[PDB]
Amino acid sequence: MVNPTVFFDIAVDGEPLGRVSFELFADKVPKTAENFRALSTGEKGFGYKGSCFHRIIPGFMCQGGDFTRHNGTGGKSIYGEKFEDENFILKHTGPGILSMANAGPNTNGSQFFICTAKTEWLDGKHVVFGKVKEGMNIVEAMERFGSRNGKTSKKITIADCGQLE
Template sequence: MLAQLVNTYPEYVQLVYRHFPLNRIHSNAQKAAEAAEAAGAQGAFWAYHDALFATQAIWAEQPPATAREHFIQLAAELNLDLEQFTADLDNSFYAPRVAEQEAQAKALGLPGTPAVILDGDLLTGQELTRSYFIWDAYVQLRLLEDRQYTAPPPMQIDLTTTYLAHVEMASGEQFVIELFPQFAPQTVNSFIFLTKAGWYDGVSFHRVIPNFIAQTGDPTGTGFGGPGYTLPDEINPALSHDRAGVVATANTGPNTNGSQWYITLASVPQLDGKDTIFGQVITGLDVVQKLTPRTPDDPNAPPGDTIARIWIEEK
């Protein structure tokens, strides 16, 4: 998982390794760490590290002398200078380095492995997710910060003007949304502002549930991203999610609207009173209905259909 993050974001994610041998639990942990350092001195730290973990079940419970032979055998398989490797291992040449890193780990309060310090907070046990989706989302959200805003845009729309949002998909297909500035002025104003800023360009429909909704508006594609500001609800009881093509805000609770929005794929009146309706698909609903079903946290989900651009027509 860590390697995948590094490979995906080589300019932003670095893996910094520190030894934390659990000597009270694993009698050979100290020498294994020293062996890895000895291999590292010959440019083979990660290859040796991977070999150690692949064979941990073999050497973990061996007597020290037998484990030593195993460590040397691994070095031989990696074509290392065995004379130098063995000398470094037997003379405990890298023991001080391992001990220093162990002391650093203890000073940070690490109770054991695995553990992660994230933005200054120590995560262990159930707090430490094994989900690649969550870690990937965290990185993407941090990168999104450079594009976010500190406050909603000033009101720039005319409530008497008709606004049509032309949504062009990467496939070349299009659909058109008539916006409702008279019912949801702040929401429509924000949508038009973000559209003109290119916020939605290249953004996918990250969550598509047949006979329910198709959701988009998050540049990270995770469902967690937003523009950096929130908008109040503008719920009008005269409007309803009573048919396919209704466009409304997606949020995490009352007054938490941002850049995400969805289109209903059927009548879903259970959403009435919860989300701000700010538009209706007036042409191209067939394009919306055939969007690829997916959920962003499914590792086997197909890629989401992508918006190429949106442009606003005023009448």
């Protein structure tokens, strides 16, 4: 079979780091993947090519993007507040793993966190539905510009994103 893939042009203060995609196992997590996909693809109806990153922990994991009604013109998980617990067929077995961190329990939303290291401490604490497709070098660069707490000096944002296949 074949799963959908989407890229995410990671920028740093205006300077694009390069290319960073993730292989979303829509086959195992279509309900969760369809979300990040429908958005990145734009089929969602509007999406949001930009987002913002201000929580990168070099040693545990990073952050994705959130938007609803904190700054304005927010959105959602292309299905209301969020969905329900789907499954964990893909347990964090190493770095470059994608998941959801919108809240945890029945809250896949779209607040993933680039797993920069097998997060076993979580143990089925979320829902995994992706994995660094290509350009891992980019994920390694960000870890260098991250603080051991969350915040960071540089501003990481998404310039462009869409389906690859």
